[model samples]
Target: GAAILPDLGTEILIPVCAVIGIAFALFQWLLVSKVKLSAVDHNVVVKCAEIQNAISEGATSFLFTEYKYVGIFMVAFAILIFLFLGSVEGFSTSPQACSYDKTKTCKPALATAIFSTVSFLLGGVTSLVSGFLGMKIATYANARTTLEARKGVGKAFITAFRSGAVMGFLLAANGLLVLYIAINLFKIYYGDDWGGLFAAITGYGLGGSSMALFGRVGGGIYTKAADVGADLVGKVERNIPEDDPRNPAVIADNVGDNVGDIAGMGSDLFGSYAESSCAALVVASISSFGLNHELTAMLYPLIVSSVGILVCLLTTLFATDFFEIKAVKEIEPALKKQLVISTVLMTIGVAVVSFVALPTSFTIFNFGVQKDVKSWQLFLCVAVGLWAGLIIGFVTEYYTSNAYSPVQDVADSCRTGAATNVIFGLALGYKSVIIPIFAIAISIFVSFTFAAMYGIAVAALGMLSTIATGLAIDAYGPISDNAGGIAEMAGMSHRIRERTDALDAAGNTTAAIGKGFAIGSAALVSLALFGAFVSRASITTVDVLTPKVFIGLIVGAMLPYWFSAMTMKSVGSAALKMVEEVRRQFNTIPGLMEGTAKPDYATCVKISTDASIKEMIPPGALVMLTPLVVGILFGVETLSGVLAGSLVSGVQIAISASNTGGAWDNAKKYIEAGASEHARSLGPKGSDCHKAAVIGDTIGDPLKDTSGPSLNILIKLMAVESLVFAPFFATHGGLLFKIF
Candidate 1:
């Protein structure tokens, strides 16, 4: 197998594209700066500035506290990866027969073990940078977005969207550049041994996921605790609006939006992107491309991703510059159009990369044998996944948007009571899964049939190819949410609040769509890594009929439930403390309800800070340890069963939990807005129906934000973790069976 392009050209192309992406992100940030607040509203601008500073300090402080613990764990885990992988071959430096071809020699296992540790540290540092950068930009833009609202919804929309694009492009480009550099640097050490090089690179994914688990679990707990506490005490009890300055938890709730939604989501998606790329590289290493040293073909996944950043750069202009949003109704469509445009553009981009980089015909390693595949077939693999993501996005929109019947009906159910609202919301979530599952199935079948695990791995990449656009839309949500909060706290005019509310409502739907993309891509990526693990471990077949596999499968299917229980209870425990603190402030401080006194915000912030940092440990430990425990004790076959079962079951719960929470939130917003006659009848604020809607929304706060979104991280982290430790598990594991 030979490549149409040369190795040096690919090396040049990837980094150049990444730099272009970084430059584009900075340009967007500059454009966002063009919205000057000092010119129009000086008083409002000052208040906005103060509020922004508070949010920034709160977010930075929380992340600093969280990262302290995560850093310690990362260093310890890096040593473990080095030790475990090195011990497999007794720490010898002698060259061994290539895993793919016994006739060829490759690098020593100890070198790879050491390099895995290097890449792991690189990925961990990059993951932290991604989340930190996102949080910084989001906090910076929240007040700017609020100030922009003085003009119109369209102005504010551009400000928030542009800020989001800044985070999106920076993260995507930074990730690609670092990975490309790592490959080149490592290539010097690995020489022509593509097999060992890529194998060590898989550690990058493990490191990214390890960090993401902490971000999601810890941040989720922080955000939901504050949100539920604020909503229940402020709206349901005190009859105050959300983000009211009188509510002690308002600032904490606002801070939660950045740390949890913006920072947590940035890390989560970065993990997905890293894992997908690593999986494709690992499988491709053993194929004809790696065997023959066809460098361009071997780096095909990176090329596709490079083009993806360029495609998303172009797609962003359509939203920010090419068109303008004149009305609130246009906001959702405007965001949706980003997905449609990026997917369409990326299809052509993938085709071009596939045609130019790969040979017309090549053989891939299918199980243990070589299977011939055409370049065109690989093109279809990427296209199927790209389109499937679009379908999932639109389907998710239908279920979660208040403009749609599913959410509308859920809102109408509030007329009966919170019980009916909860029932309808749960049912809507269950029903929403049908289409996304089908879309995922079709993509899987198409890709799996074409090139097996390698095809599936690239498919996952294809789905994430438009991730810049996806993250932009996703990050826009929390920024707008924070803007609305700042508007409320500043005691801005009702008109400004109305404008921010409209932006926020549209953001809700887009956020859910982002979750859909995350969940769908996680499934494909996890399955691909699972396949890579099987190959790496030299497991020929996984028989479900075997007692070991069956037991693992049953227990694996229950893991999500167990993980969810831990997170849900953590949120509940934290929220209970938050509610009590808020109640104490109101009861103890005179004139608090009448807005005559400033309520204490620091105590409430401390409550969330302490609880999230403490409560996140158990769930984090559960996810990180499960694969190791099962793989070492029960062996690879059982671990294979565990991976499959979790994937099947985790995808369902993640999809349902996310959609259900989204529906409940939108239903509450629907009643609050009272845009339609039906909505007006249900709302007018503090009506029985509105209160019931509020109650349902409180219950959903943890489901959607805390547990639902974090489940994807669990599934993906466990898979990549298993893949990283496969060598160790295969060589020396199953000690109990050996003794018995």
Candidate 2:
């Protein structure tokens, strides 16, 4: 009963908080829009820009500024207050498992609350320091750039924030819709009866949302880098005097290309595969635990989730970086040697971690150990990983090569018996028809096998569930990232074409890093939350709809929107202010008339900088406020369900929309580049015919890679949790009875 308290508490808290936050944001927005200002203070704009530049340069000068420091201080203070509040509530109270009298566990709850508060305060301080440092760096970078250059940078940042916010809003709305739909479906399926079905659908939808958000955030970062690369290679270099289009150096300068392609590709592939692997592991572990010992299965999922995150981060960083350095530098012999060494080290690392982290009793090959792991199980995991990786790599490579290819070309290629002959040919054009069939077959087989083995019809459901979820997520990620990239590139190209301007290598690098930071930060939250969920479940009986779960869900859902909105408003305001300042400066010029001269790059940069700094405060406040508000008002379960659902839907929508955009963008580029008249050929009957084909093929990637697999993970986690607590529930009779 104590364990389930948190879940019940959260169910009531989230909806209440969301209503409050939305109201507050709406009120503030109205006031900001309607309130009059004194003709856009020019000085304010200039000062804001200066502050931004200082921060960008990694200087701490902005900290000395009264308003800037005040904002930071207020944010920290608010966080501290929230932490204290949370501590007062504690673990054994609303959301924690407790005895019926509730008096028995009061002390434990108090202790947990106090500890949580202290930890939260510490985290707040860390964030404050990091934010301060980040601001200084931005300021410093801005101070050195030309006015025109600064304007571009400011615009890019603004664009990122806007894009992110839009994505967030869409996701939230979509989640609500999904919930509504699913609830209705449940009514239809069960004929107006609501029981575990509500919980299951809510849990599944929320899980799917989480996975989608993770993929989009990760993809967003990679796409930003790609955009920067395209700007350099396609626009900047092409416009440079005496620059050769085909020069190796020119091509190599598109470093953002590799960052975007490889990192984005790898993340999508890994996320999908990991989801699948986690699902399988959870199912197997739960089954073993339920049938044998209760405690063993209860502990396994948590351990695996915790360790798995670390392993994933390490594996990806090592594999991509090691292979990249060798390949890019063109040192074949040295590359081979390094690959050998790295491979050996990586294998050892994986083996050690797997052995130590995994349950010894759940082993396939025990050797001398007392564990029950069979060698075959271990081999199966590895084989699956390898197979998935190969399929993903092949698909990515094919898409990259044929991004601009037409439907007719695809068809012709299919008919000429040259499809298989070509390395990346879509399996002789049979891919369009064959792959889905194969996937369906595979899913059916897996489902049947699971049903036979587990004697549970739901186990068989995992097959379609896994694939559908994976495809949706995977498809959305690349497309969204690519679309964002195109938008960035479009903006950059417009600026360059108008002014004959260029982004320096450093600027390009910084842009990529900034994009990465934005997207990665958002995605990392989900990863961390997932880890926490796994960890917390290890020791307790908290269900999917618990306080901690709400914390993870709400934070994940709101952070992106809050950040984006604040950033955009700030920068936009600053831009207008800078225009006024530039006008004033021109008035001081001896022979310059008020309307004769335009604002220089310096003024533009200043405006952008100032607006950004000022705008960030509100959004930042909202981000911090979300968790607290949810914690305080409705309880955790409501918060968790709403947040998780929102995040997942937002991510999926962003990815899908972006992919559709990218396909169009690429098609336009193909026409502009004069690849062929294929664009015209796809007329009424084939309007976006090629794009549709591309979309079709791309659908498989995310469905198998992200959405389906991610849902599987959640289901598996729930199943495992259920299995672990089954014995305890059996012994206790009922949750309420156990508490009493």
Candidate 3:
């Protein structure tokens, strides 16, 4: 064993990193608070505060309501985990043979069943905290960013970026910290049974994704329903501006951004981080790390996460402290620089970590055999994914950013009508998948070829190492979006709205880039989870020509489409009602359009709230139940094919859908900005071309926000859910197959 560090060294390093991450987030929040308004702007500040309060209340109420139902499901699901895993050895009380070494006897499966339930509940609670805290920070900062825009673009950029950092750092650090604590706490009971300990810990990822399923779906619907309703009624029918106070749906739309883009996004990446780390830990337990009982090497993924926190800290200082934004042009470039600088610095950090923390050479357990691998090779595996994330971002920007020809062409298509714009948008999304697919394929081959599932899992971690930084840029988009809304609602100077629009537009590009990392990392982690499922289920191979594999493959591929349909329809159906309500308010309320009377904002909020809560159940049940139903009825062999089919097919559609939706949105922005003659020809806001772009953007809304982005979670949640239940499947499943 080339393990180079003391066990104490690892125990100290991990918690310290977590603390630093938390401390940094608090510090950023402190700086954001330093920028105040209240007595200064007077009326403007009061208006901003009022709007912020409504949004905060709407978001807070919706989150609690959604979590109530989801929390009950979590409790019920934990019971299933204990029952099924407990039944593995007939709920036996006596000690059993350690899976790693049959010659040695360890604790009972009953103990594992108990701890697994504990960890699942713990993970679900942690996931909820991330969502709630993220929403709190987002709503608090939206108005502040609007107030800052009065100074300059530089002031507004700082407020928005720091606000995002608050969410990014807190979520990352808390996840790492809780996971470390989970391991140390579990170790006390299991003692030397590291294999069994981590095996039980797979429930952590299951718990995280379980919460995320509702968080993403319910948050997405809540956000998009209001967004579509606001746009269709405000822009299309009444010819008023977005986020206008006269528009009944405006407040709901602002609230939706925090719920969906911030809280939902925070919860989503938290699941990705939790699952990637858990998957790596599970595979390593059967490998050399567990065989020699090397505690330092066993904690490698956390070590990587520790380094990522520090690296992201340095990266944030670049945007927050090192440079300044002077003009509208500098905003997007500064955000882009966060990815570039963090990737470069994190590459160095990964190298140092690889050399010092790991042995010069070690053996990793591949499928059914030992594989020799070097520290440098491991570094490259991580580095491949680290750099590949950048590549994906670049490709995403090219396809979705207004600065690029692709999205501009989509806007140009609006010159004809919504049909041509849709045609170009769909084409752009299909073509956008090519380079990212290649990047993912290359990373998969290198990580798998060198270090097997362990390497692939670590590679996923590598890509997400700078999650704080990635999330900062991503979350910055939605906050800036809200800032513009507040600026409009508060009736600020046109100059303020103009500045916020610039920031919001840049955020759009960065948001697409964030989707790239999220969707990309989801693919790698889902595959890794599938591989772990195979090992746990005792599957040797999955041949597609077999009837079981083929049928499962077809069914698996169809899951995303079916899931997408349900979510898309949910947004559409809710939005249709929202449109009707808004029209009703405008037609009936005296002087509503003239701005002398307030529209009924509460009714619009209630409509979105009711629709999001009622509609999220069916899709959530579909993903949550599929693996169990398929494994129990069709067998592991078929489930294997299903996992494979979904991974490949889901990624393709997700990439296309996100890109298409983003392209249409940006195309509309380009026209609205009228930065060039090409844009002015299409705009002035009420032109036929602008109306065409509006419908195209509307169509793309559900595609990107409701259905497209949520597909990645479907891919990931199903895989992790399968892995957690694999043992139960192996022991008690395949009823139909057995009978036949």
Considering every candidate listed, which one attains the maximal lDDT?
Answer: 1
Error of 3 at 597 (Å): 0.7
**How well is each residue in 602-683 modelled by candidate 3, as lDDT tens digits?**
9998999999999999999999999989988888888888898888999999999998988888888888889889999989
> Per-candidate TM vs. native?
0.99, 0.37, 0.99
Candidate 2 regions exceeding 4 Å error are: 1-348, 356-359, 362-601, 656-740
Lowest lDDT sum, 10 consecutive residues, model 2, at 460-469
The positional error of residue 708 in candidate 2, measured at the CA in angstroms, is 22
User: Per-residue lDDT of 1-740 in model 1, one digit per residue for the tens?
Assistant: 67777888998999999999999988888888776553124787888888888899999999999989999999999999999999999999899998788988999999999999999999898898899999999998999999999889999999999999999999999988889999889999999999999999998888888998899889999999999999999998989898999999999999999999999999999999999999999889889888888889999999999999999999999988899888888999999999989999999999899889999999888999999999999999989989999999999999999999999999999989999999999999999999999999999999999999999999999999999999999999999999999999999998898889889988888889988998999999999999888888889888889998888888888999999999999999999999999999999999998899999999989999999999889999999889889888888888988999999999999999999998999899889888889999998989889999999898988999989999999999999999989999998887778779
* Clash count, one per candidate: 0, 85, 0
Compared with the true structure, all predictions reach lDDT values of 0.92, 0.29, 0.89
> What lDDT does candidate 2 reach at residue 284?
36
Which residue pairs come into collision in candidate 1?
none
Local lDDT at 368 for model 1? 91
Model 1 worst lDDT window (10 residues): 33-42
The model with the greater TM-score, 2 or 3, is 3
